[PDB]
Amino acid sequence: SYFEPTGPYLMVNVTGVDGKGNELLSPHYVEFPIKPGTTLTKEKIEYYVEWALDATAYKEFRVVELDPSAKIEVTYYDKNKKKEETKSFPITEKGFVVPDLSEHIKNPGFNLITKVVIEKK
Amino acid sequence: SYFEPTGPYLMVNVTGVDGKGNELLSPHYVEFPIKPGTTLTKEKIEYYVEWALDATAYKEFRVVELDPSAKIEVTYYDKNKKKEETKSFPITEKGFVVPDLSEHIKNPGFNLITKVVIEKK
């Protein structure tokens, strides 16, 4: 989409490094629409980061491992409170259920900012 | 109905959380007409909260458990006394019989404000 998203979306910002910690790829903004009620697990996330790499020169690369302390975070202005609120979800196998924040924001961005070790297919 | 109800109705205001206490869904006003003399039990109530979720993005979710200390409450201005009165009904298996308060108010709202643990069908 050429315009801002109109619904919830996952925002992937990842730095790809090699097994030795040489950076190979800088964060590339890539968005994927997502719906509240969806369960996002570590494996789905690893696929989303792989899909994100296909929009770059490392399209033939696969994820070897994600920073295990990476989390999904969303920030928004709570209307009632006049406060900025932040919610963080850990990335585990069983995963978490995407909340519906439309009460405060129609198009929340769930951000994933992290490093991933990647390797050629 | 586009206009205020003309009779007794149950007002469901529920916050859906997951097994870990992550809020997923904010209270959504949903009303269901109800008649005095009707017996409202815990199971009927759990169905009403499930029906209430179908008017949201968690329509495919089912209730796992309601806050056991939740109660049904109705508030109204007693005409005679010039006093606000409040009656509270506990949510049990055998349930309670819906009173007729038309003497004081034609369209009392029986409110249910509570948290429910919900899960995908």
Interface test with B, best of A85, A89, A100 (most B CBs within 10 A): A100
B54 interfaces chain A, CB cutoff of 8 Å = no
Number of Cβ pairs < 8 A linking chain A and chain B: 32
Comparing CA positions, the residue from B118, B117, B108 lying closest to residue B34 is B108
Q: d(Cα A120, Cα A58) in Å, to the nearest integer?
A: 8
B89 phi and psi angles, rounded to 5 deg: -120, 135
Map tokens 């975070």 to a residue.
A73
With beta carbons under 8 A apart, name residues in chain A contacting B57: 35-37, 100
Structure determination method = X-ray
A37 interfaces chain B, CB cutoff of 8 Å = yes
- Here the tokens at position B4 are 């205020």
CATH architecture of B1-121: Roll (3.10)
Amino acid at B81: K
- Here the tokens at position A91 are 């990335």
Q: d(Cα A84, Cα A89) in Å, to the nearest integer?
A: 17
Q: Nominal resolution in Å?
A: 2.2
B41 interfaces chain A, CB cutoff of 8 Å = no
Subunit contact A96:B56, Cβ cutoff 8 A: no
B22 interfaces chain A, CB cutoff of 8 Å = yes
**Longest Cα–Cα distance in chain B:** 49
SS3 call for B45: helix
Subunit contact B24:A36, Cβ cutoff 8 A: yes
Find residue A96's DSSP bridge partners.
A40
Interface test with A, best of B58, B64, B115 (most A CBs within 10 A): B58
- Here the tokens at position A84 are 């900025």
The answer to whether the CB of B13 falls within 8 A of the CB of B112 is yes
CA distances in angstroms from A22 to A18, A116, A117, B7, listed in the order given:
6, 11, 10, 70
Q: Where are the domains of chain B?
A: 1-121
Subunit contact B26:A100, Cβ cutoff 8 A: yes
Comparing CA positions, the residue from B14, B23, B109 lying closest to residue B55 is B14
**A36 to chain B, minimum CA–CA distance in Å?**
7
How much of chain B is helix, strand and coil, in % rounded to 5? Answer: 10, 45, 45
**B60 to chain A, minimum CA–CA distance in Å?**
9
Q: d(Cα B121, Cα B118) in Å, to the nearest integer?
A: 9
Alpha helices in chain B (DSSP H): 42-53
The answer to whether the CB of A42 falls within 8 A of the CB of A36 is no
